[PDB]
């Protein structure tokens, strides 16, 4: 679709980055975002960094958004998707972390669809 190819192909502008920061800020303020605000503490999960290849967290993405790290929206979505995929990979489905990744990813998808619609019209 128009938004699909534009997500893959259209380079991010300074205007887009205003939308990326807003989406991220709305995630950081969500009540179920508490496990993803900062990197996982390895004292809380000893084997986490031995099994998770590419860890990710909202503070790392905030730094990358600040430094204009992302060139395409797909790269931004890929980093965010890693946060939730890493969580559901390491934790059981009845874990509070797992449940948070399910709620927050749905919330992110709602906000991402709003951002994609604002770039095209």
Ligand X SMILES: Cn1cnc(Nc2ccc(CCN)cc2)c(Cl)c1=O
DSSP of 34-48: GGGSSPPPTTTSTTH
Report which residue's Cβ sits closest to ligand X: 35
Nearer to ligand X, 45 or 77 (CB): 45
Q: Which is nearer to ligand X, 90 or 115 (CB)?
A: 90
- Asked if 55 and 40 touch (Cβ cutoff 8 Å), the reply is yes
Query: Which CB sits closer to ligand X, 76 or 97?
Result: 97
Distance (Å, rounded) from C-alpha 16 to C-alpha 47? 37
In the complex, minimum distance from the CB of residue 100 to ligand X, in angstroms, rounded to a whole number:
7
The DSSP letter of residue 95 is S
Nearer to ligand X, 38 or 75 (CB): 38
Contact set with ligand X (CB under 6 A): 35-36, 38, 40-41, 44-45, 48, 87, 90-91, 97
Of 80, 90, 77, residue with least CA distance to 12: 77
Q: How far is the CB of 59 from ligand X (least distance, A)?
A: 10
For the bound state, the minimum distance from the C-beta of residue 35 to ligand X, rounded and expressed in Å, comes to 3
Query: Which structure tokens are listed for 100?
Result: 């948070």
């Amino acid at each position: 679709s128009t938004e699909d190819a534009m997500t893959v192909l259209t380079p991010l502008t300074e205007k887009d980055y205003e939308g990326l920061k807003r989406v991220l800020r709305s995630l950081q303020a969500h009540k179920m975002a508490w496990p993803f605000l900062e990197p996982v503490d390895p004292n809380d999960a000893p084997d986490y960094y031995g099994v998770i290849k590419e860890p990710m967290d909202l503070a790392t993405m905030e730094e990358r958004v600040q430094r204009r790290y992302y060139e395409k929206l797909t790269e931004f979505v890929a980093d965010m998707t890693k946060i939730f995929d890493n969580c559901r990979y390491y934790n059981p489905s009845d874990s509070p972390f797992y449940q948070c990744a399910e709620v927050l990813e749905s919330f992110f998808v709602q906000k991402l669809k709003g951002f994609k619609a604002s770039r095209s019209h």
